[PDB]
Design a protein around this ligand. Structure first.
Ligand code: ADP
Ligand code: CL
Ligand code: MG
Length: 405
């Protein structure tokens, strides 16, 4: 951020600050399961208040509600409650993020007010698909809520969404989390230790598969696990995959991606066995399957199996640097957590013999919290997809949109 305004050089005295944060925290049974992303924004929030900000208005998305209000399922209200404990200060929750009523609440706040808006993605204009004049009007509303703008939303920095690139105020500054994360990755990606292994898993398959092409120019090995594997195995092995996650669009490029991995000398490790479930539920009936057996109709693969764990461990043993986004199964549910646990054990062991290990993402970082490995890997990042986009070599949109020095 040498070329961008950052919060350390932003005059906030007497100013209303509107701040984009990544408060897309994991939720299970309606409780926040990891406050990592909230805690990570506290240094920028506190700095603003300590240096005399009139207000700090916080805005984020939660989940993928796709432009419809879903306060029953994706409200940020619980985050407001959690932010209070972590700050040592109260925070006021608004039930929308734009327009007359919100604008009134943010126009002239009492000194030191902290305000959290509702889920930005309840509006189609944030993404904005799920309309140009409506997008403009949305951006104009958000811009009224502060006098200056800070973006500390590292985990969302890969998204060219309205709150991330479309706020129109004279000074748009990077926050301290944005700076911390970009600095770590700048150093870690400049001359990676090799072999450099990317571990790709998770559930955002369509997006993740689109990152592989450029990542194949940077890494020496790739594990393709979690929900992503099934698209590859269906195409390459003609494997029956039942109701497992599948990306029809990404399927069309699987063979080209494997061709490019061969050309670039990147070893691809896919799973060979699975823990299956008869429905997407913590208490599903479970089974086992191999690539050769296929997965039965009406069943889904929700974890890898033991032979896959062995292959993943072999890649980890070869690695001198690892970047991991996306668990290799539904680790939130114990029936489907063994694969991710075993891989975490390997990654912690690797760190202890000098591997540089980077784990990132809202859910993937929660694996570190669950198994108490946050200080047993090199870096746990608030960005997952955002971090993979840095690995590709891009300038993230949320950084590009900041004010130039
Ligand atoms: N085989 C699978 N099927 C469906 N979901 C999966 C599978 N493997 C992992 N997941 C899920 O992936 C989610 C995390 O993916 P993602 O959101 O892309 O990662 P992150 O939050 O680190 O960016 C977890 O909630 C996990 O349950
Ligand atoms: Cl996706
Ligand atoms: Mg996630």
């Amino acid at each position: 951020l040498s070329n961008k305004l950052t919060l350390d050089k932003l005059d906030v005295k007497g100013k209303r600050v509107v701040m984009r944060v990544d408060f897309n925290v994991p939720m299970k049974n309606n409780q926040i399961t990891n406050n990592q992303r909230i805690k990570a924004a506290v240094p920028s929030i506190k700095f603003c208040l300590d240096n005399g900000a009139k207000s700090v208005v916080l805005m984020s998305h939660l989940g993928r509600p796709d432009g419809v209000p879903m306060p029953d399922k994706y409200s940020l209200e619980p985050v407001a409650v959690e932010l209070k404990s972590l700050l040592g200060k109260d925070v006021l929750f608004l039930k929308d993020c734009v327009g007359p009523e919100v604008e009134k609440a943010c126009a002239n706040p009492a000194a030191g007010s902290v305000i959290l808006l509702e889920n930005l993605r309840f509006h189609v204009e944030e993404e904005g698909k799920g309309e140009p004049a409506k997008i403009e009007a949305f951006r104009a509303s958000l811009s009224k809520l502060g006098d200056v703008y800070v973006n500390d939303a590292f985990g969302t920095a890969h998204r060219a969404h309205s709150s991330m690139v479309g706020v129109n105020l004279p000074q748009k500054a990077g926050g301290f989390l944005m700076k911390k994360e970009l600095n770590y990755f700048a150093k870690a990606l400049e001359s990676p230790e090799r072999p450099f292994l990317a571990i790709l898993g998770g559930a955002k398959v369509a997006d993740a598969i689109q990152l592989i092409n450029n990542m194949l120019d940077k890494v020496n090995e790739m594990i393709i696990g979690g929900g992503m594997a099934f698209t590859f195995l269906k195409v390459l092995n003609n494997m029956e995959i039942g109701t497992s996650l599948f990306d029809e669009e990404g399927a069309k490029i699987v063979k080209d991606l494997m061709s490019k991995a061969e050309k670039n000398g990147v070893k691809i490790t896919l799973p060979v066995d699975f823990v299956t479930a008869d429905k997407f539920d913590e208490n599903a009936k479970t089974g086992q399957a191999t690539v050769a057996s296929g997965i039965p109709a009406g069943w889904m693969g929700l974890d890898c199996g033991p032979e896959s764990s062995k292959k993943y461990a072999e890649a980890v043993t070869r690695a001198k640097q690892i970047v991991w986004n996306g668990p290799v199964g539904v680790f939130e549910w114990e029936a489907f957590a063994r694969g991710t646990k075993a891989l975490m054990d390997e990654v912690v062991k690797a760190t202890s013999r000098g591997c540089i290990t980077i784990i990132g993402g809202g859910d993937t970082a929660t694996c570190c919290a669950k198994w108490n490995t946050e200080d047993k890997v090199s870096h746990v990042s608030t960005g997952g997809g955002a971090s993979l986009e840095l690995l590709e070599g891009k300038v993230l949109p949320g950084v590009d949109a900041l004010s130039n020095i």
